[PDB]
Amino acid sequence: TETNLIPSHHYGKAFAPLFASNAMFTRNQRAVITREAFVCARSAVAQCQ
Amino acid sequence: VCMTNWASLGDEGRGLEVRLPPPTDSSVHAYKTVLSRGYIDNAQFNPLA
Secondary structure (H helix, E strand, C coil), rough: CCCCCCCCHHHHHHHEEEEEEEHHHHHHHHHHHHHHHHHHCCCCCCCCC | CCCCCCCCCCCCCCCCCCCCCCCCCCCCCCCCCCCCCCCCCCCCCCCCC
């Protein structure tokens, strides 16, 4: 490890620039679109056949 | 204050000394020998060490 580390101070500063980048909220927005594009396309090949 | 070998004569010396400055000054320079080089600037002591 480093010379003098603290696992609370070091983990907090390293996880701090990752919780500001909203990729946790970009997952949920892409999730419901992938759900909503699924049912409108599964029922788009099911009303043709 | 703790000043080692402030009154010694007729010898070379041991080699190392501990000489705290009086409490009007900083007296932090004797408590930065380990875990205090390039982690904490030259004005503070390290209370975790």
